[PDB]
Design a protein around this ligand. Structure first.
Ligand SMILES: Nc1ncnc2c1ncn2[C@@H]1O[C@H](COP(=O)(O)OP(=O)(O)OP(=O)(O)O)[C@@H](O)[C@H]1O
Ligand SMILES: Nc1ncnc2c1ncn2[C@@H]1O[C@H](COP(=O)(O)OP(=O)(O)O)[C@@H](O)[C@H]1O
Ligand SMILES: [Mg+2]
Lengths: 383, 172, 211, 351, 193, 29, 52
């Protein structure tokens, strides 16, 4: 029926079972804890033992405590009432307004949408930043990436992009907080109640956003699946409702780091420089679920912290294949005092082609690329 | 060689018992001739298998958690960081030279707590609450959870107060 | 010392007393945040606390990673620096402001502990050993140091004149390395050198002199 | 006549001890072969790469959340094979040999083993006649012969796919005015690209008309680890069909560094001993037996050719990184495509 | 200088104890003598608590481990092959290695008798003709002149037929698999036609 | 119940088979 | 009999040099972990070791 925790090593705990072991990526519960604890199984040990990952802190698990099986993957409550709600990884209200006014819980672990239902029609997403809309034009329903160092201005572009596109759309959006600061989390809650995206009172059903927050304080079980919890409620509004939903995920690099913090702890040899061996199916499984199909549209907005402006580390070097439009932030242009410090050379999108937009857009942006590459090749010799 | 063969091994199929009547008679005088070489079976306490340099590996302790302060028999305080299958890896607060193979490990049950409050204004403790400033123990103080998670999103507000440093290199 | 608590884990103590001392150090200061007051915390030598974390795990048969530091060492410094905050009105309005200290390995900003703590914290103050011998004491780097909240985080009368201070310092750091020709042309390539040099000679001060 | 031919199978078994991350360690299977394609209970296939004393390591071609402990694996008795032939032309298959286009099955095809040895010495004839690839910077400056190995190395966002696909469109611009024998068929093998980028690539081969000549093998980033590992071998096994029929074929591996990320991800999961930059030691051998498979067979053994265009994505132009060090060593040359001079108007930035 | 040959090979350092044990006992022709003597020690390890403390306690010294086992092992009818074995495991703390060394010695003894397990599952219980028609297809699925045991079993989801769970092989002649494979040969020909 | 700790081998001295072999051949007559 | 406390000395018998050991870890098995302060060439696995 049910089993017990047999072994605790930091943020990974081991549950033994007496027959009929749980399927991989299911949910477990411990009773008598302070908060409800969800264990997500990642591998079978072999001796009737699943090996888990912890959605909250394990400090308090006794050896042998009762563990039940929900027999099913992690269920978050999806729905139209979930707008205007600050949501956890495991389906909780953390804005302290009752329960979630929604039904039809859904498995947040699934397969990617297939090759047959792929959209190739591309529409230029005019944002309102003169370096974005000229040089690296975003795609409606496509992918928007944001690299750059810690202190170059990534997150202040993201809320600026919310004010650009997430207000002038009318439909629904989702802010997927994956391991950023609470300061840029709490401040965004105030500047969407005042801007009226999230409402309080009896007008909770006309709002435009859900906030799925897996900020830096949580152990890396929660920081590794808040990307998926924010994703599936966006994929719930796509297939069932048909509306275009804007996914504003912050720190995709913190999704891959939260995997890598315990990937060695599950019994795996480290990969290149010390990141995780299974980063390809971790991130590639994440990204291709975020697409636009025939049924609806998801316009992903991805911010990525890169360490010390070095794009040779393999944890962002897998992301460059996975992003159509890329807004690479240089600290040099910010050291010039120029905001936004968007690279004219490193930041290049996929819409930039005269066969789609028109020759009047492609030639000036290429004309920008001639005058700015030679300015870099001459500012060495100007000294 | 599977677990059903192990559960089949739980079913007795011996077909004869021409030892069990006599080995049950010489068992008890054997364990009571060599009785002095037996440490008692320890369940909710702990006893050290291996000890060294601040990490001491302790058998038993079915009752502990992760992050429970433990107390060794010399008064040394400890912490259970990980809990393996048969043993519990215990981190040792302080010098560890006094612990042997076979010494008792006492669970205190609580999460590690260092005294908090305004009576500590003027005192220098270490990371454990013990005073080193030579002014005796802490008065008008209380214990608190050092493993507490941060205040949530609904708990915070926008910062306003500038926190002057008194340094023109900073504040400007 | 009347308004100062100090938790002091020496290097001649064991590892976990150094591992817990910033954790117990913020346990004192959460009380000052909980009861409405404001709290200052300085987590001095926070890299050496992380070495105090690295000692315990590598004896504990735990897998190492970057620079033989363990996996979860981001989560160590994360919840060490997330429990400092500014609460809402509904819990007294108390505050905590955080000073972590990370010593670079003579100039590795891509050092493993550094990239964690530069991404957690909100503002950084670079102190190179270059600027410490050019007379600039304290040796703050200006072009590399950022904050978050900007206005309503300085003195408000200082806040108007700070834009006149920062942007003139921005051009001056670009013209200071262009002194290899002897130009001083058109009364601007000399004056922004004349201004920002006195700005450097403005912004020095003395050790232990709170003004 | 199907009911009259139903002899039940005796098929040998294996039970799973430990399964995780797309790696299932099975017990039993007293006769499974090295690299033999096995099948699980829940319809997902598998290959056993390493075979140890007590448990046998099996890598999984697909989702891994379906297998519990104590499930069963059936041996198919065959090393992993892909359906090769002309009916694949225009189809978009996965690397294992199943179609994902939504066009039903692949008919007029034949399955053949993806793991054979390269052509020997006497199979070879010296490459003399040239392949033409449309980009004049490739054809005149750093030329490429029919039956030759040439590496499209570069940065990302720099046009390595563009040098690949503009060669493909040139073949469709050349095959319509060239006789039946010397027509260069394309198999652009997509490794590690998105499931939406291939949707743009299936569009450009249809809209131009090249889908009469192209087979798009797209193991994405979204599927499991060994599909991205096997997609170059199966795609070159598709190029095997056009070799011994005597035609000329163009085989392109794109972002073969991701196939190195594929062979890294399974090796450290299978606890094989790691080497330089934590890749396995034999990754140079698994790159060479791929890239030595495409060549020019001589006038006694078929006369056909096979020219392979692998692609390595660098980081900032380091041509001494370990993965690029291997492929530059086994291939002939380099078409170095730098990102910095790409904005200097020389298109392609062919240094 | 020659040992009687092991009938099948095994893995190492915990199961080749049994391979060595079979290579010793078959030289002494004590095969079914000592095999159920291993069973008694498991019942000794099941019922009694003082002996099974000695197989897992990490605090008993290395001389009380041997001076209880050789104290318990007098003659008592017990073989000195067995007595020198259980001295050796308590010599080097390997008293926990008993539940593995038996089941491979069980396997090796059933490898000496050519005597393979099976488990046949039907929807209907097997009568005295239905069971004797079963074996004549089952003995096509053993490789030689082996024995056969029966472990007849009932499950409702199979709609007649059987599945021979050899634990090494499986033959599905159940109709619930046949109607499933009949449906897959329907769909592979209606979509192609 | 009383055999869950005995469910697997656990020992030191990975060359254990060579130790026991010299303690199994003496009783060979 | 009884394993001595950590950082205590040992005195070996029967060596050509008065060789001293210092216990640092109690490595289980009623066996401790030492670092030899002098030349270790010639230690046989039966030599009597006494403590101060
Ligand atoms: N001749 C050209 N003129 C203008 N743009 C070009 C040209 N060739 C390639 N590009 C640009 O290259 C971009 C992508 O092309 P391609 O996929 O070949 O590059 P890539 O190096 O493969 O990138 P990645 O490796 O990230 O997939 C497009 O945005 C396109 O604008
Ligand atoms: N357009 C802009 N206007 C004003 N400040 C900016 C602008 N762009 C960036 N910044 C500054 O850059 C700093 C870093 O912002 P943030 O997005 O938090 O960086 P990171 O994403 O690296 O944490 C902010 O303090 C912000 O003031
Ligand atoms: Mg590419």
């Amino acid at each position: 029926d049910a089993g017990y925790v047999s072994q605790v090593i930091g943020p990974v705990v081991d549950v033994r079972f007496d027959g009929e072991l749980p399927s991989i990526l299911s949910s477990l519960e411990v009773e008598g804890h302070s908060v409800r604890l969800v264990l997500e199984v990642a591998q079978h040990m072999g001796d009737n033992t699943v090996r888990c990952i912890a959605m909250d802190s394990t400090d308090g698990l006794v050896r042998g405590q009762k563990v039940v099986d929900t027999g099913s993957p992690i269920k978050v409550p999806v729905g139209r009432g979930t707008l205007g709600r600050i949501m956890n990884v495991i389906g909780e209200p953390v804005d302290e307004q009752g329960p979630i006014d929604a039904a039809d819980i859904w498995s947040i672990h699934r397969e990617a949408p297939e090759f047959t239902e792929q959209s190739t029609e591309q529409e230029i997403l005019v944002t309102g930043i003169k370096v974005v809309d000229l040089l690296a034009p975003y795609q409606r329903g496509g992918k928007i990436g944001l690299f750059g160092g810690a202190g170059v201005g990534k997150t202040v572009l993201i809320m600026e992009l919310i004010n650009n596109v997430a207000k002038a759309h009318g439909g629904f959006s989702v802010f997927a907080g994956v391991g950023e600061r609470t300061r840029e989390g709490n401040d965004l809650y105030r500047e969407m109640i005042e801007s009226g995206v999230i409402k309080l009172g009896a007008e909770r059903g006309n709002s435009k956003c859900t906030l799925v927050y897996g900020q830096m304080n949580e152990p890396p079980g929660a920081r590794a699946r808040v990307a998926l919890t924010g994703l599936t409620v966006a994929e719930y509004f796509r297939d069932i409702e048909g509306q275009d939903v804007l996914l504003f995920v912050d720190n995709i690099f913190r999704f891959t780091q939260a995997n890598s913090e315990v990937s060695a702890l599950l019994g795996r040899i480290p990969s290149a420089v010390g990141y995780q061996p299974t980063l390809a199916t971790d991130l590639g499984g994440l990204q291709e679920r975020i697409t636009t199909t025939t049924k609806g549209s998801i316009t992903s907005v991805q911010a990525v912290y890169v360490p010390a402006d070095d794009l040779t580390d393999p944890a962002p070097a897998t992301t460059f294949a996975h992003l159509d439009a890329t807004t690479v932030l240089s600290r040099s242009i910010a050291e010039l005092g120029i905001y936004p410090a968007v690279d004219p050379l490193d930041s290049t999108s996929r819409m930039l082609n005269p066969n789609v937009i028109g020759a009047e857009h492609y030639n000036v942006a290429r004309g920008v690329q001639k005058v700015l590459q030679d300015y870099k090749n001459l500012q060495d010799i100007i000294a | 060689a599977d677990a059903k063969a192990l559960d089949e091994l739980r079913k007795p199929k011996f077909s004869s018992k021409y030892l069990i009547q006599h080995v049950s008679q010489k068992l008890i005088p054997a364990v009571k001739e060599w009785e002095k070489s037996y440490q008692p079976p320890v369940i909710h306490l702990g006893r050290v298998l291996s000890v060294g340099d601040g990490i001491a590996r302790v058998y038993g302790l079915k009752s502990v958690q992760a992050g429970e302060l433990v107390c060794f028999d010399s008064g040394v305080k400890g912490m259970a960081l990980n809990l393996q299958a048969d043993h519990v890896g215990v981190v040792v607060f302080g010098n560890d030279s006094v612990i042997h193979q076979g010494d008792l490990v006492y669970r205190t049950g609580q999460i590690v707590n260092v005294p908090i409050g305004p009576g500590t204004l003027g005192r220098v403790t270490d990371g454990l609450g013990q005073p080193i400033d030579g002014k005796g123990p802490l008065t008008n103080v209380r214990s608190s959870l050092v493993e507490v998670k941060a205040p949530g999103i609904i708990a915070r507000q926008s910062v306003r107060e500038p926190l002057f440093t008194g340094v023109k290199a900073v504040d400007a | 010392m009347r308004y100062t608590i100090m938790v002091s884990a020496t290097a001649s103590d064991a590892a976990p007393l150094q591992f817990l001392a910033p954790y117990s150090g913020c346990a004192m200061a959460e009380y000052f945040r909980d009861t409405g007051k404001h709290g200052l915390i300085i987590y001095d030598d926070l890299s050496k606390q992380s070495v105090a974390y690295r000692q315990m795990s590598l004896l504990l048969r735990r897998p190492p990673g970057r620079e033989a530091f363990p996996g979860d060492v981001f989560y160590l410094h994360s919840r060490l620096l997330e429990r400092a905050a500014k609460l809402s009105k509904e819990l007294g309005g108390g505050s905590l402001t955080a000073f972590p200290v990370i010593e670079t390995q003579a100039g590795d900003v891509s050092a493993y502990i550094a990239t964690n703590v530069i991404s957690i914290t909100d503002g950084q103050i670079f102190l190179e050993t270059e600027l410490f011998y050019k007379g600039i004491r304290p040796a703050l780097n200006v072009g590399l140091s950022v904050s978050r909240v900007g206005s309503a985080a300085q003195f408000p009368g200082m806040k108007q004149v700070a834009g006149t201070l920062k942007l003139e310092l921005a051009q001056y750091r670009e013209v200071a390395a262009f002194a290899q020709f002897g130009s001083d042309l058109d009364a601007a390539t000399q004056y922004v050198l004349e201004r920002g040099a006195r700005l450097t000679e403005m912004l020095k001060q003395k050790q232990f002199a709170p003004i | 006549e199907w009911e009259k031919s139903y002899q039940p199978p005796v098929i040998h078994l294996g039970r799973v001890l430990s399964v995780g991350d797309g790696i299932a360690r099975v017990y039993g299977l007293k006769s499974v072969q090295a690299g033999e394609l096995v099948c699980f209970d829940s319809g997902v296939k598998g290959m056993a790469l390493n075979l140890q004393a007590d448990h046998v390591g099996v890598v999984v071609f697909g989702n891994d959340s379906v297998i519990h402990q104590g499930d069963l694996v059936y041996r198919t008795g065959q090393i992993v094979n892909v359906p090769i032939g002309p009916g694949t032309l225009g189809r978009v298959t996965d690397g294992l040999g199943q179609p994902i286009d939504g066009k039903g099955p692949l008919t007029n095809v034949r399955s053949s083993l993806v793991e054979v040895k390269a052509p020997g010495i006497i199979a070879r004839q010296s490459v003399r006649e040239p392949l033409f690839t449309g980009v004049k910077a490739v054809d005149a400056l750093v030329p490429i012969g029919r039956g030759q190995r040439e590496l499209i190395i570069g940065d990302r966002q720099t046009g390595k796919t563009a040098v690949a696909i503009d060669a493909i469109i040139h073949q469709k611009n050349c095959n319509e005015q060239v006789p039946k024998a010397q027509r260069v068929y394309c198999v652009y093998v997509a490794v590690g690209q998105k499931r939406s980028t291939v949707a743009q690539l299936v569009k450009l081969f249809t809209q131009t008309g090249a889908m009469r000549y192209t087979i798009m093998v797209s193991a994405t980033a979204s599927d499991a680890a060994p599909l991205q590992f096997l997609a170059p071998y199966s795609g070159c096994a598709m190029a095997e069909y056009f070799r011994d029929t005597g035609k000329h074929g163009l085989i392109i591996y794109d972002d073969l560094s991701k196939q190195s990320v594929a062979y890294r991800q399974m090796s450290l999961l299978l606890r094989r001993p790691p080497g330089r930059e934590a890749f396995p030691g034999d990754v140079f051998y698994l790159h060479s037996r791929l890239l030595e498979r495409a060549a020019k067979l001589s006038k006694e053994l078929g006369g056909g050719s096979l020219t392979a265009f692998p692609v390595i994505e660098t980081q900032a132009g380091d041509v001494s990184a370990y993965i690029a060090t291997n492929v530059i060593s086994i291939t002939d040359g380099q078409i170095f495509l730098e990102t910095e001079l790409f904005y200097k108007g020389i298109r392609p930035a062919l240094n | 200088l020659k040992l009687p040959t092991a009938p099948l090979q095994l893995s190492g350092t915990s199961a080749q104890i049994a391979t060595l044990l079979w290579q010793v006992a078959a030289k002494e022709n004590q095969l079914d003598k000592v095999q159920d003597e291993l069973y008694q020690f498991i019942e000794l390890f099941k019922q009694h608590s003082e002996l099974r403390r000695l197989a897992t306690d990490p605090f008993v010294p290395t001389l009380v481990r041997t001076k209880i086992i050789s104290s318990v092992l007098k003659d008592s009818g017990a073989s000195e092959i067995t007595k020198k074995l259980f001295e050796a495991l308590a010599d080097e703390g390997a008293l926990s290695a008993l539940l593995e060394v038996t089941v491979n010695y069980e396997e090796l003894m059933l490898a000496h008798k050519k005597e393979v397990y099976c488990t046949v599952i039907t929807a209907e219980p097997l009568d005295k003709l239905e069971r004797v028609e079963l074996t004549k297809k089952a003995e096509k699925f053993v490789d030689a002149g082996f024995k056969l045991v029966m472990q007849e079993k009932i499950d409702k989801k199979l709609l007649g037929g059987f599945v021979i769970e050899f634990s090494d092989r499986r033959v599905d002649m159940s109709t619930a698999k046949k109607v499933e494979e009949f449906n897959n040969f329907v769909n592979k020909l209606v979509l192609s036609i």
